Design a protein around this ligand. Structure first.
Ligand SMILES: CNC(=O)[C@@H]1Cc2ccc(NS(=O)(=O)O)cc2CN1C(=O)CCc1cccc(C(=O)O)c1
Ligand SMILES: [Cl-]
Ligand SMILES: [Cl-]
Ligand SMILES: [Cl-]
Ligand SMILES: [Cl-]
Ligand SMILES: [Mg+2]
Length: 297
């Protein structure tokens, strides 16, 4: 049971060992498409690639490759697309994927500039009056509005398929204070943000999978998805004791490599799930408390 395990790992100081056993046990599947010469400039990092079996294929129209994976959680009945931060030449591909996969929400857990370097392209418009046209994939993207909080921003975007003139509203949930290879400020800050994504309807099974990304699309993105899936599993069953967090992470790692990149991110995931369980099991009042503790205003 997660809280008993947490306390035992903490008391024995064994987060590093627990985390390394996950790394050891994790699936290794081929990434031959990602490694084709023609795809080199579509990958941000040499050592982060989608497995062939779970990669998202683009439907246009000479190279179907994007560095993105479908994390299909069968038991939880929820799917996520995890992807790297788009590159200057892959922003059209990114929005093509969003369109084709019928995603309603994009969750971004990094900043464009981190530690002096460009870790993600500026792939969405910052001003209403300066829309973006992706000529390669025939899409237009307009900023409709934004709600700027202290450590996250929610944007309403309009994505238009220029070939058909169909438009869709996309919600962008941007966590602006989650350091690379780091953790959120508190369980409260994290959960307040997760619940904002959930409240939007973006995770509904009536939509395509939410797109979640950071820079590599594995460390921060993996932490987010693990917490969400574990909370969903216990919610479906109304049984916190039924959820085996390490098993869930190993299952997710069947679909994309390297999910959760530090031992402290794993530790944080446990803290987030244990805290979120209070809400799932009927203490409604905790949600307001998280909002207060997150100092979002
Ligand atoms: C310190 N690592 C790096 O800077 C690069 C590039 C990079 C950048 C930023 C990262 N953080 S993220 O995913 O944006 O939150 C993660 C990584 C992962 N990296 C990797 O090389 C991943 C290698 C890897 C690949 C697959 C599995 C594992 C694992 O043992 O968990 C590790
Ligand atoms: Cl940014
Ligand atoms: Cl910086
Ligand atoms: Cl970039
Ligand atoms: Cl950072
Ligand atoms: Mg203005």
């Amino acid at each position: 049971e997660m809280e008993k395990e947490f306390e035992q790992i903490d008391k024995s100081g064994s987060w590093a060992a627990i985390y390394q056993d996950i790394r050891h046990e994790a699936s290794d599947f081929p990434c031959r498409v990602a490694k084709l010469p023609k795809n080199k400039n579509r990958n941000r990092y040499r050592d982060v690639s989608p497995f062939d079996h779970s990669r998202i294929k683009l439907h246009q129209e000479d190279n179907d490759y994007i560095n993105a994976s479908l994390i299909k959680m069968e038991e939880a009945q929820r799917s996520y697309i995890l992807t790297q931060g788009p590159l200057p030449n892959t922003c059209g591909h990114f929005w093509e994927m969003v369109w084709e996969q019928k995603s309603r929400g994009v969750v971004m857990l990094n900043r464009v500039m981190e530690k002096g370097s460009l870790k993600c392209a500026q792939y969405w418009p910052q001003k209403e009056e300066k829309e973006m046209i992706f000529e390669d994939t025939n899409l237009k993207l307009t900023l409709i509005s934004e709600d700027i909080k202290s450590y996250y921003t929610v944007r309403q975007l309009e994505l238009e398929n220029l070939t058909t003139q169909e438009t869709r509203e996309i919600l962008h949930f941007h966590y602006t204070t989650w350091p690379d290879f780091g953790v959120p400020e508190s369980p409260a800050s994290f959960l307040n943000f997760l619940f904002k994504v959930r409240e939007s309807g973006s995770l509904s099974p009536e939509h395509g999978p939410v797109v979640v990304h950071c820079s590599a699309g594995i460390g921060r993105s993996g932490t987010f998805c693990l917490a969400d899936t574990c909370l969903l599993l216990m919610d479906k069953r109304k049984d916190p004791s039924s959820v085996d967090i390490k098993k869930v992470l190993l299952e997710m790692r069947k679909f994309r490599m390297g999910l959760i990149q530090t031992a402290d991110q794993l530790r944080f995931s446990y803290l987030a799930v244990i805290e979120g369980a209070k809400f799932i099991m009927g203490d409604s009042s905790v949600q307001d408390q998280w909002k207060e503790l997150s100092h979002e205003d």
